[PDB]
Structure formats: C-alpha cells, structure tokens
Amino acid sequence: SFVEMVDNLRGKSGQGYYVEMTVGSPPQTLNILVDTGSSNFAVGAAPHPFLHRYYQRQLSSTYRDLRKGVYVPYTQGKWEGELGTDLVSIPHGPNVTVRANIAAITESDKFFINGSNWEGILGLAYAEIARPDDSLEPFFDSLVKQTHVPNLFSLQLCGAGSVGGSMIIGGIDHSLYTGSLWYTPIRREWYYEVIIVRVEINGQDLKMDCKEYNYDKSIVDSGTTNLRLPKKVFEAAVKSIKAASSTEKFPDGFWLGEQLVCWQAGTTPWNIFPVISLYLMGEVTNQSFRITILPQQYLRPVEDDCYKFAISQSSTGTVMGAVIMEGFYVVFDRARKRIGFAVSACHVHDEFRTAAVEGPFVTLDMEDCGYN
Numbered sequence: 001s002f003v004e005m006v007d008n009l010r011g012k013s014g015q016g017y018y019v020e021m022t023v024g025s026p027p028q029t030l031n032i033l034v035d036t037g038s039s040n041f042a043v044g045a046a047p048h049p050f051l052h053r054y055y056q057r058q059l060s061s062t063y064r065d066l067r068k069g070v071y072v073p074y075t076q077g078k079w080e081g082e083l084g085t086d087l088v089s090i091p092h093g094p095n096v097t098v099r100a101n102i103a104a105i106t107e108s109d110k111f112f113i114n115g116s117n118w119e120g121i122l123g124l125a126y127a128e129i130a131r132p133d134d135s136l137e138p139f140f141d142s143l144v145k146q147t148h149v150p151n152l153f154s155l156q157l158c159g160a161g162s163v164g165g166s167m168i169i170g171g172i173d174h175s176l177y178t179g180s181l182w183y184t185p186i187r188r189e190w191y192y193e194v195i196i197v198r199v200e201i202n203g204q205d206l207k208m209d210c211k212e213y214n215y216d217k218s219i220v221d222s223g224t225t226n227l228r229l230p231k232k233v234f235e236a237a238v239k240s241i242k243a244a245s246s247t248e249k250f251p252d253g254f255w256l257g258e259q260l261v262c263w264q265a266g267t268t269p270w271n272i273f274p275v276i277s278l279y280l281m282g283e284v285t286n287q288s289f290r291i292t293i294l295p296q297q298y299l300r301p302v303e304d305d306c307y308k309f310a311i312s313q314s315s316t317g318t319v320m321g322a323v324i325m326e327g328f329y330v331v332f333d334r335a336r337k338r339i340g341f342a343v344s345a346c347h348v349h350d351e352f353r354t355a356a357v358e359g360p361f362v363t364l365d366m367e368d369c370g371y372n
C-alpha cells in the first residue's frame, strides 16, 4: 500500500536512512532520518557546521511555541532544543498533512554527521520513551489520530544493490518481498521490543539460557547500524565466528569494531564467515521462526574491498540494527502488536547461500526467554 512511497529512502552506509519531509507554511524541505529506536521528531533549527539547511520557525505561518524545552541523549550523540508544533507532510508518502510535535534543535553534540544529507530525525517508537515524557505525542501517533492512515508502516532497507529503500506508511506493499511474512509479538509498547528464543551460527545452537539473548531487552532499531548483542552473547558469537574463519587471522581492533580489514577486490572470502540464525517468538503457542543473516550483512563495507565487523557489545540488550534489517522487509504492525519479517526484493547476494525467513519451528517455554 502503495507505489508512491517505493524508494523514498536514501542514505550513506553507516549514517542511517532518511526520507524527505516538509514542515511549516510555506513548506520547508528537510531530509529526516527514520528511527524506530526512539520517539522524538526533532530537526536542525539553527546553524551547525554539518547542516546545509535547517528549520526556520519565524518563516512559518503555522508554527506554535510550546514554551517548554527538551533534550535527548542517544547511545553517543545528543541534542537539546525547543518544543513546538507545526504542519508536517511526507512528499513521497501518503497524501496528508498533520500537526505534529517537533523539537527545534538549538544545540547538539555528536548528533549531526559530516557526510550527511539529513537535517533531523523521526522517532517512530512509542510515547513511553519519548522526552521530556510520555505526554509528548509521537509523530506516527498524531498522523494516525488525525487521518485515516492505518496504524502500520513497513521498512525495506536496501544495502547498495550509497543505500536506498522504502518506507511504506499505512501498509504493506506486496511488491517489496517474496515468500511469507513471519510475525513476532511486540512484547511491550515502548521500543519495538521482541523476544529471541534461539540463536545458531552455521547451524550450531549457541546453547545459552534463552534469557541471555534478551538481557535486558531485544529491540528492532533502524537508527542503530550494527547488530548489538549482550556481553555474554557477544562473547559466544565472536568466539564461533573467530573459529569458523580461523583459516585467516585478523587484528583485535577488527573484532572490537574499530579497524577495517581488506582483501583484493573480488576476493573477499565470504564462505569462511558463518551465517547467523535468530529465532523469534511466533504467533502461536510453542511456535517460532528464524531469520538468517549472511556475512554480507554483518561485514559492512567501508571505502580493494574493505569492511568493518558490524556486530558490537551491548550493556543495554540486543539491538537488531540496520544491518540486520537490510535485505528483509520488516512490517511494524502496531495495530496488531506485531512485527513481520519477509525476504526483501533487495536481498543480499551470495552465490551459494541466502538470507531466509523460515518457519514454523517448535520451541518450548518461549515465555521463559523474556528478561523479568
């Protein structure tokens, strides 16, 4: 649901995906990063070395001040600014205009990125995690309350098939995937929180208490680049990934996500890097499904062929970031408290292996896999 939004995303590797928006009357055009890992809609509203444009409130006939300040601290970066409401629309989007909350960003630190082409962020997760508090209605919530747009969006993030993709607001576009959608419950409405019931690398169960995979949570987050795994899980995965690829040897800064590794163009040894299967809780009792990630997703290319290890240690739970979401079509079915995965039409290539969404699997005591 529908052709107008196909290919409405762009970006640079490791700097997120953005969609074109306009705010104010007359309309001012900004590129906005699409972030299911937070819930604030915020935009450059003042000069910055890295911004090529920004939101000019005084130039907008429709702007209203909320006379209240705001700040948001992300994993690394943070911004603060001023709350208002203005009229907002997505040009390659549904055909509508909403009055939404906007944080006019006045100061920032390590937020905007030099390469960038985006001037703001669209937090698509739920009011619970919004700043300054849950009474600040998120953008998707206002678009739903104010229009007829169904309460569902879908993200097809593609990986260089200078990245691109689609954000279908309001529905599912059957032209963007193959095979069946498989759905996992949204465990609680705050982040897009899910439960991982099993983990296998090259078909070997990690054999951990399934609570460790969700410790203290597992989320789907398009605003975080890497797959981020709890310490105990990170250690076990890097252990098997090391051993699968031991034929060759790598700097330590490589496994820590720091320094790139290189091979002669067209000779990257993909076969020595294992596939990772994440099993998600399903819709029916004792039933789950798996997504399989290929090394082409977790060895993210940096500009010979050169890559960073795109899995990292977490102390805040599992993060399924952009590299996991790439080559899947991921449906955020808020209306039904579920997230659907299918093989995307921009799926990642290997000459001998494929990324897959497969089910059904039987898995006992999936309830026990949730932390607390």
Ligand SMILES: CC(=O)N[C@@H](Cc1cc(F)cc(F)c1)[C@H](O)CNC1(c2cc(CC(C)(C)C)cs2)CC1
Binding pocket: 015, 016, 033, 035, 037, 038, 039, 072, 073, 074, 075, 076, 077, 078, 110, 111, 112, 113, 129, 130, 131, 191, 219, 221, 223, 224, 225, 319
């Ligand atoms: C890398 C990163 O941090 N990405 C930002 C998006 C981003 C992209 C970018 F290019 C630059 C940034 F500074 C931020 C994304 O929201 C991360 N989502 C999560 C967190 C959100 C928050 C804020 C709350 C929800 C507590 C208010 C803290 S961790 C769950 C992990």
